[PDB]
Amino acid sequence: NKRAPYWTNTEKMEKRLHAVPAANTVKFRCPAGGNPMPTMRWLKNGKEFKQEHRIGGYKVRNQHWSLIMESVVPSDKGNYTCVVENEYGSINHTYHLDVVERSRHRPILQAGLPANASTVVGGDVEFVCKVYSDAQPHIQWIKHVPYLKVLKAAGVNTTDKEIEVLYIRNVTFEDAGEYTCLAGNSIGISFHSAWLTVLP
Amino acid sequence: PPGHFKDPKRLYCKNGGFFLRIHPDGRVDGVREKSDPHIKLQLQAEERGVVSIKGVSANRYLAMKEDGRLLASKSVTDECFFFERLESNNYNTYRSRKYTSWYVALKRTGQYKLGSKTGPGQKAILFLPMSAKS
C-alpha cells in the first residue's frame, strides 16, 4: 500500500493564523501519513528554518509532525511552512505567526500632565491627560470641592477621542482648585492632579 | 509595548483563529480574513473594567441577549456591556455585565457560541486584541 504523503488530521490545520501573546509557546502541526514514511522539513518565510534563526532555537517532534517555539517574541512573526514528502509526492501547508506583547499594569499617566494653570476671571483654560494602558482604561476628570465632583467621564456618549482634554471656559473664582485625571482599568487605578489659579 | 487604547482593534479568538465580526445587519460571527472591513472594532470603557464593543463599519454595538445569543444593535443597551479581564495566559475575556456567567465566544466553525454554553476554562472565550492596521 505505497502512497504519496497526505494530511491525517486537517482539523488541527484549519487555523492558519496563530496570533499569540509574547512569552507563550507556539506549536504548529502537520499530521501526515504515507508509505514510505514521508520526511518533514520546516521553512520560515519560504526559506530553511535553522536553529540559529531565533534565540533558543526550536524543537521538532517527528512523532507529532510538529514545530515548537518557546517564549515567542515579536521577531518570530512570519510564515512557517511544513513540507512533507516521499518518492510519490510533496505537499506543504503554511501558518502565519503574529506575536502581541501584553502589559498587565494599571494605567500609566505621563508625568507633568495635567499641568497647573493660571488665568484671570472670565478667561479660558484646559487640562490635558495622556494615558497608556493595555487593559481598556476608564478616564474621568474630577474636581476637589474627600468631597469630589465628577466633571466628565468616558463612555459611549463621551468617547475617549475627546476625554483626554478638559476645557474650562469663562472661569469664575469658583472654578479655582485641584483638578484630577483619574484612570482605572481592571488591574488598578492611577491619577495625576493639577491646580487652577484664578486672578482678579 | 506598541499600541494605543483609543485606537480601533481587531479581536482575535484563539479558538480557530477567527476575528470577531460585526455585520451591518446586526449578525455576529467570525472570519479569518484580516482584510474584512467588519472586524475593525472600537472598545470603550463605560466604567472600570467594563467596556462596550462597537463594529465601526456596521456602526452597531455588540450585545448578548437573554438566551446567550450574540448580535449587534444600533442603539446601546445594558446588554452591550462586558467585564474585560486579562487572564494569566495573557488573553482577554469578555463577560456580560447583565448575564454575569456568560462570555463572548466563537466556535471552531466560525459562528458565535451560545453564551449559556461558555465557561472560564474554554478556548472559545479567549481573545487577543490586535492593531486594526495593515
Tab-separated table of C-alpha atoms in Angstrom:
chain	number	residue	atom	x	y	z
A	1	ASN	CA	0.000	0.000	0.000
A	2	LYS	CA	2.565	2.587	-1.187
A	3	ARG	CA	1.299	6.172	-1.472
A	4	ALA	CA	2.174	9.848	-1.539
A	5	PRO	CA	2.073	11.975	1.635
A	6	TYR	CA	-1.294	13.119	2.956
A	7	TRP	CA	-2.632	15.110	5.897
A	8	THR	CA	-4.009	12.734	8.534
A	9	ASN	CA	-5.820	15.409	10.547
A	10	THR	CA	-6.792	18.527	8.651
A	11	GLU	CA	-8.839	19.703	11.649
A	12	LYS	CA	-5.681	20.607	13.549
A	13	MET	CA	-4.532	22.559	10.457
A	14	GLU	CA	-7.565	24.741	9.722
A	15	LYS	CA	-6.291	27.529	11.999
A	16	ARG	CA	-3.880	29.289	9.618
A	17	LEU	CA	-3.173	32.490	11.554
A	18	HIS	CA	-1.790	31.913	15.038
A	19	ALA	CA	-1.753	35.202	16.946
A	20	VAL	CA	-0.272	34.710	20.390
A	21	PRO	CA	0.898	36.823	23.333
A	22	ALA	CA	4.667	37.239	23.707
A	23	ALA	CA	6.358	34.728	26.041
A	24	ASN	CA	3.940	31.908	25.208
A	25	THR	CA	4.850	28.686	23.415
A	26	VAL	CA	3.717	28.176	19.836
A	27	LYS	CA	3.137	24.782	18.293
A	28	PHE	CA	2.490	24.143	14.598
A	29	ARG	CA	1.365	20.704	13.457
A	30	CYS	CA	1.020	18.989	10.095
A	31	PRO	CA	-0.058	15.380	10.937
A	32	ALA	CA	0.915	13.310	7.947
A	33	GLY	CA	0.889	9.761	6.644
A	34	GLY	CA	2.367	7.976	3.662
A	35	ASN	CA	4.281	4.922	2.528
A	36	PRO	CA	7.165	5.099	2.736
A	37	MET	CA	7.050	7.362	5.813
A	38	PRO	CA	7.425	10.871	4.405
A	39	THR	CA	10.075	13.308	5.634
A	40	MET	CA	9.246	16.660	7.224
A	41	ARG	CA	11.013	19.979	6.821
A	42	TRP	CA	10.059	23.399	8.169
A	43	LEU	CA	10.543	26.729	6.435
A	44	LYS	CA	10.354	30.263	7.823
A	45	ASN	CA	9.323	32.813	5.190
A	46	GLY	CA	9.927	30.349	2.378
A	47	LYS	CA	13.498	29.550	3.482
A	48	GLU	CA	15.079	26.810	5.563
A	49	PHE	CA	14.469	27.431	9.277
A	50	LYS	CA	17.720	26.928	11.207
A	51	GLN	CA	18.240	26.698	14.965
A	52	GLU	CA	20.333	29.872	14.953
A	53	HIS	CA	17.468	31.847	13.401
A	54	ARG	CA	15.989	32.667	16.845
A	55	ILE	CA	17.275	32.805	20.404
A	56	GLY	CA	16.926	29.348	21.920
A	57	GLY	CA	16.224	27.772	18.551
A	58	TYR	CA	13.227	25.493	18.156
A	59	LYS	CA	12.101	21.934	18.784
A	60	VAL	CA	10.643	19.310	16.481
A	61	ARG	CA	8.810	16.142	17.466
A	62	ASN	CA	8.688	13.858	14.406
A	63	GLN	CA	6.150	11.554	16.017
A	64	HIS	CA	3.792	14.541	16.260
A	65	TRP	CA	4.777	16.280	12.988
A	66	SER	CA	5.173	19.463	14.996
A	67	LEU	CA	7.359	22.559	15.199
A	68	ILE	CA	7.655	24.137	18.641
A	69	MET	CA	8.902	27.609	19.513
A	70	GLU	CA	9.105	28.590	23.171
A	71	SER	CA	8.878	32.079	24.665
A	72	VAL	CA	7.903	33.780	21.420
A	73	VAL	CA	8.773	37.411	20.802
A	74	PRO	CA	7.755	39.923	18.092
A	75	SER	CA	10.644	38.920	15.827
A	76	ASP	CA	9.213	35.397	15.477
A	77	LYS	CA	6.455	36.937	13.386
A	78	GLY	CA	6.358	35.464	9.892
A	79	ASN	CA	5.234	32.482	7.831
A	80	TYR	CA	6.041	28.901	8.754
A	81	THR	CA	5.687	26.164	6.182
A	82	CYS	CA	5.797	22.428	6.655
A	83	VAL	CA	6.943	20.428	3.632
A	84	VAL	CA	6.219	16.706	3.746
A	85	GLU	CA	7.398	14.316	1.076
A	86	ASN	CA	8.310	10.834	-0.158
A	87	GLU	CA	9.049	9.483	-3.637
A	88	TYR	CA	5.383	9.648	-4.652
A	89	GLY	CA	4.752	13.294	-3.869
A	90	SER	CA	5.346	16.506	-1.975
A	91	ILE	CA	2.828	18.682	-0.136
A	92	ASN	CA	3.022	21.778	2.059
A	93	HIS	CA	0.929	23.960	4.327
A	94	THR	CA	1.645	27.434	5.655
A	95	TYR	CA	0.883	29.060	9.000
A	96	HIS	CA	1.301	32.723	9.851
A	97	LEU	CA	2.545	33.691	13.275
A	98	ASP	CA	1.884	37.003	14.989
A	99	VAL	CA	3.047	37.972	18.442
A	100	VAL	CA	1.383	40.564	20.656
A	101	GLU	CA	3.027	41.993	23.741
A	102	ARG	CA	0.672	42.328	26.682
A	103	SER	CA	1.050	44.677	29.624
A	104	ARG	CA	-0.545	43.700	32.959
A	105	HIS	CA	-0.131	47.094	34.628
A	106	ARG	CA	-2.658	49.590	36.000
A	107	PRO	CA	-2.949	52.747	33.771
A	108	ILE	CA	0.193	54.890	33.447
A	109	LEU	CA	-0.093	58.667	33.065
A	110	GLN	CA	2.520	60.985	31.582
A	111	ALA	CA	4.494	62.886	34.205
A	112	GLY	CA	3.581	66.580	34.201
A	113	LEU	CA	0.026	66.096	32.919
A	114	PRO	CA	-2.322	67.570	33.673
A	115	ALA	CA	-0.296	70.742	34.244
A	116	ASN	CA	-1.141	73.558	36.659
A	117	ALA	CA	-2.810	76.563	35.065
A	118	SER	CA	-3.489	80.210	35.888
A	119	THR	CA	-5.849	82.786	34.408
A	120	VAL	CA	-7.782	85.976	35.131
A	121	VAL	CA	-11.509	85.666	35.824
A	122	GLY	CA	-13.510	85.284	32.618
A	123	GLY	CA	-10.661	83.535	30.834
A	124	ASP	CA	-10.456	80.035	29.340
A	125	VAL	CA	-8.185	77.114	30.212
A	126	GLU	CA	-7.527	73.443	29.505
A	127	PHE	CA	-6.132	70.397	31.284
A	128	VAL	CA	-4.627	67.546	29.285
A	129	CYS	CA	-4.075	63.957	30.291
A	130	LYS	CA	-2.106	61.293	28.403
A	131	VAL	CA	-2.664	57.658	29.350
A	132	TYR	CA	-1.011	54.369	28.500
A	133	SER	CA	-2.870	51.123	29.161
A	134	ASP	CA	-3.329	47.696	27.604
A	135	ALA	CA	-6.400	46.680	29.625
A	136	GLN	CA	-9.078	49.147	28.405
A	137	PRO	CA	-8.786	52.220	30.703
A	138	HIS	CA	-11.674	54.342	32.005
A	139	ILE	CA	-10.866	58.023	32.247
A	140	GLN	CA	-12.643	60.734	34.164
A	141	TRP	CA	-11.998	64.267	35.362
A	142	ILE	CA	-12.612	65.226	38.973
A	143	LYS	CA	-12.673	68.479	40.924
A	144	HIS	CA	-11.919	68.512	44.645
A	145	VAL	CA	-14.640	70.556	46.334
A	146	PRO	CA	-12.663	63.916	50.209
A	147	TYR	CA	-15.690	65.736	48.687
A	148	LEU	CA	-15.195	65.200	44.936
A	149	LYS	CA	-17.184	66.142	41.842
A	150	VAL	CA	-17.133	64.302	38.517
A	151	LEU	CA	-16.917	66.837	35.694
A	152	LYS	CA	-16.540	64.412	32.799
A	153	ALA	CA	-16.434	60.622	32.403
A	154	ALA	CA	-15.667	58.419	29.406
A	155	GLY	CA	-18.319	56.190	27.904
A	156	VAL	CA	-20.436	55.508	24.836
A	157	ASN	CA	-21.561	59.139	24.843
A	158	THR	CA	-18.215	60.639	25.894
A	159	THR	CA	-15.711	58.784	23.701
A	160	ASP	CA	-12.025	58.597	24.627
A	161	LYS	CA	-11.459	60.583	21.441
A	162	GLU	CA	-12.080	63.763	23.414
A	163	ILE	CA	-11.900	62.669	27.066
A	164	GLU	CA	-8.176	63.464	27.307
A	165	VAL	CA	-8.689	67.239	27.259
A	166	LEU	CA	-10.764	69.148	29.788
A	167	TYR	CA	-11.844	72.678	28.858
A	168	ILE	CA	-12.976	75.248	31.421
A	169	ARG	CA	-14.417	78.394	29.801
A	170	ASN	CA	-15.342	81.746	31.363
A	171	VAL	CA	-13.592	80.708	34.551
A	172	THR	CA	-15.074	82.065	37.771
A	173	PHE	CA	-13.358	82.115	41.154
A	174	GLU	CA	-15.482	79.064	41.920
A	175	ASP	CA	-13.542	77.127	39.268
A	176	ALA	CA	-10.299	77.570	41.217
A	177	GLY	CA	-8.910	74.462	42.869
A	178	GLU	CA	-7.483	70.990	42.324
A	179	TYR	CA	-8.356	69.056	39.158
A	180	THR	CA	-7.669	65.350	38.779
A	181	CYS	CA	-7.465	62.995	35.824
A	182	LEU	CA	-8.331	59.533	37.145
A	183	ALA	CA	-7.674	56.472	35.001
A	184	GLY	CA	-8.649	52.972	36.001
A	185	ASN	CA	-8.591	49.525	34.416
A	186	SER	CA	-9.238	46.009	35.687
A	187	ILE	CA	-5.792	45.915	37.275
A	188	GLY	CA	-5.796	49.193	39.172
A	189	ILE	CA	-6.251	52.925	39.464
A	190	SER	CA	-3.938	55.862	38.691
A	191	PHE	CA	-4.339	59.644	38.887
A	192	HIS	CA	-2.439	62.915	38.449
A	193	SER	CA	-3.612	66.286	39.748
A	194	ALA	CA	-3.202	69.909	38.696
A	195	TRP	CA	-4.179	73.216	40.249
A	196	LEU	CA	-6.178	76.044	38.717
A	197	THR	CA	-5.406	79.567	39.945
A	198	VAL	CA	-7.870	82.391	39.242
A	199	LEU	CA	-6.744	86.028	39.414
A	200	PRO	CA	-8.805	89.277	39.683
B	1	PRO	CA	4.599	47.786	24.318
B	2	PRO	CA	3.366	49.019	20.831
B	3	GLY	CA	-0.177	50.383	20.515
B	4	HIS	CA	-2.819	52.714	21.966
B	5	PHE	CA	-6.093	52.101	23.830
B	6	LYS	CA	-8.291	54.521	21.886
B	7	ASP	CA	-7.304	53.053	18.525
B	8	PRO	CA	-9.783	50.654	16.909
B	9	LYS	CA	-8.806	46.983	17.128
B	10	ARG	CA	-9.440	43.517	15.771
B	11	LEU	CA	-10.405	40.921	18.363
B	12	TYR	CA	-8.721	37.610	17.536
B	13	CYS	CA	-10.273	34.478	19.025
B	14	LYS	CA	-7.823	31.744	19.956
B	15	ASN	CA	-10.464	29.152	19.113
B	16	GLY	CA	-9.953	28.547	15.398
B	17	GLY	CA	-8.217	31.878	14.995
B	18	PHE	CA	-11.207	33.917	13.832
B	19	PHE	CA	-11.532	37.685	14.100
B	20	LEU	CA	-14.763	38.831	15.747
B	21	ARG	CA	-17.006	40.261	13.028
B	22	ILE	CA	-19.976	42.601	13.361
B	23	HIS	CA	-22.150	42.687	10.216
B	24	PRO	CA	-24.044	45.828	9.061
B	25	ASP	CA	-27.266	43.888	9.544
B	26	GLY	CA	-26.520	43.031	13.165
B	27	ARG	CA	-25.199	39.479	12.665
B	28	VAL	CA	-22.149	38.485	14.727
B	29	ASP	CA	-19.707	35.786	13.646
B	30	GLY	CA	-16.024	35.215	12.942
B	31	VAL	CA	-13.756	35.215	9.891
B	32	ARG	CA	-10.121	34.596	9.115
B	33	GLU	CA	-9.755	37.323	6.503
B	34	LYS	CA	-7.717	40.177	8.032
B	35	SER	CA	-8.904	42.423	5.181
B	36	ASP	CA	-12.591	42.133	6.045
B	37	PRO	CA	-13.970	45.610	6.898
B	38	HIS	CA	-16.409	44.422	9.558
B	39	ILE	CA	-13.783	43.166	12.042
B	40	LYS	CA	-12.490	46.645	12.868
B	41	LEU	CA	-13.874	47.377	16.325
B	42	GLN	CA	-13.846	50.209	18.817
B	43	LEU	CA	-13.520	49.333	22.505
B	44	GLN	CA	-14.843	51.858	25.014
B	45	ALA	CA	-14.848	51.640	28.805
B	46	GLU	CA	-18.132	52.663	30.420
B	47	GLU	CA	-16.558	52.228	33.867
B	48	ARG	CA	-13.537	50.462	35.381
B	49	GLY	CA	-13.070	47.056	33.814
B	50	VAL	CA	-16.258	47.374	31.731
B	51	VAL	CA	-16.448	48.017	28.009
B	52	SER	CA	-18.753	48.196	25.031
B	53	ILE	CA	-17.594	46.793	21.706
B	54	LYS	CA	-18.644	48.603	18.538
B	55	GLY	CA	-18.325	47.383	14.982
B	56	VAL	CA	-17.040	50.558	13.335
B	57	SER	CA	-18.289	49.827	9.816
B	58	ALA	CA	-21.575	48.329	10.978
B	59	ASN	CA	-21.943	51.213	13.435
B	60	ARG	CA	-23.593	48.731	15.829
B	61	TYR	CA	-22.726	47.677	19.395
B	62	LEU	CA	-22.014	44.066	20.314
B	63	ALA	CA	-24.618	42.661	22.653
B	64	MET	CA	-25.626	39.403	24.284
B	65	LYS	CA	-29.324	38.574	24.594
B	66	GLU	CA	-31.197	36.824	27.429
B	67	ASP	CA	-30.728	33.458	25.726
B	68	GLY	CA	-26.991	33.857	25.206
B	69	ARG	CA	-27.323	34.849	21.557
B	70	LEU	CA	-24.881	37.390	20.171
B	71	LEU	CA	-25.754	40.248	17.849
B	72	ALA	CA	-25.139	43.975	17.464
B	73	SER	CA	-27.714	46.733	17.870
B	74	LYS	CA	-27.708	50.266	16.526
B	75	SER	CA	-28.557	51.538	19.995
B	76	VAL	CA	-26.638	50.930	23.231
B	77	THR	CA	-28.494	48.975	25.935
B	78	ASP	CA	-27.481	47.229	29.139
B	79	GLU	CA	-26.809	44.086	27.132
B	80	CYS	CA	-23.892	45.842	25.377
B	81	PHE	CA	-21.512	45.886	28.367
B	82	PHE	CA	-18.809	43.386	29.269
B	83	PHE	CA	-16.248	42.949	32.015
B	84	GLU	CA	-12.895	42.828	30.245
B	85	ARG	CA	-10.421	40.595	32.003
B	86	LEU	CA	-6.780	39.916	31.238
B	87	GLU	CA	-6.267	36.250	32.161
B	88	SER	CA	-2.999	34.724	33.393
B	89	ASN	CA	-2.371	33.182	29.958
B	90	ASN	CA	-2.376	36.767	28.647
B	91	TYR	CA	-5.531	36.610	26.510
B	92	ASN	CA	-8.640	38.719	27.180
B	93	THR	CA	-12.128	37.527	28.064
B	94	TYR	CA	-15.388	39.474	27.804
B	95	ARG	CA	-18.071	38.512	30.273
B	96	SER	CA	-21.582	40.036	30.105
B	97	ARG	CA	-22.299	42.520	32.898
B	98	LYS	CA	-26.013	41.670	32.635
B	99	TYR	CA	-25.747	37.865	32.314
B	100	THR	CA	-22.759	37.520	34.630
B	101	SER	CA	-21.809	33.925	33.829
B	102	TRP	CA	-21.815	34.064	30.030
B	103	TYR	CA	-18.828	35.079	27.879
B	104	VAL	CA	-18.455	36.388	24.349
B	105	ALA	CA	-17.146	33.407	22.351
B	106	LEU	CA	-16.651	31.854	18.932
B	107	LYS	CA	-16.944	28.175	17.951
B	108	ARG	CA	-14.332	26.398	15.830
B	109	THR	CA	-16.810	26.682	12.959
B	110	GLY	CA	-16.688	30.463	12.888
B	111	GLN	CA	-20.109	31.062	14.375
B	112	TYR	CA	-20.600	32.531	17.827
B	113	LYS	CA	-21.094	30.175	20.747
B	114	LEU	CA	-24.211	30.480	22.909
B	115	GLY	CA	-23.358	32.472	25.998
B	116	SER	CA	-25.132	29.821	28.030
B	117	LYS	CA	-22.610	27.240	26.809
B	118	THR	CA	-19.477	29.218	27.703
B	119	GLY	CA	-17.238	28.773	30.733
B	120	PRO	CA	-13.952	30.046	32.309
B	121	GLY	CA	-11.668	27.289	31.011
B	122	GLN	CA	-12.814	27.265	27.380
B	123	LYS	CA	-10.642	28.099	24.390
B	124	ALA	CA	-13.672	29.750	22.788
B	125	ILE	CA	-13.755	32.679	25.250
B	126	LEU	CA	-10.110	33.703	24.770
B	127	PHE	CA	-9.462	36.766	22.637
B	128	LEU	CA	-6.384	38.764	21.759
B	129	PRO	CA	-6.743	42.420	20.825
B	130	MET	CA	-4.757	43.392	17.746
B	131	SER	CA	-3.996	46.507	15.744
B	132	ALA	CA	-6.590	47.350	13.117
B	133	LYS	CA	-3.870	48.433	10.689
B	134	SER	CA	-2.317	46.542	7.762
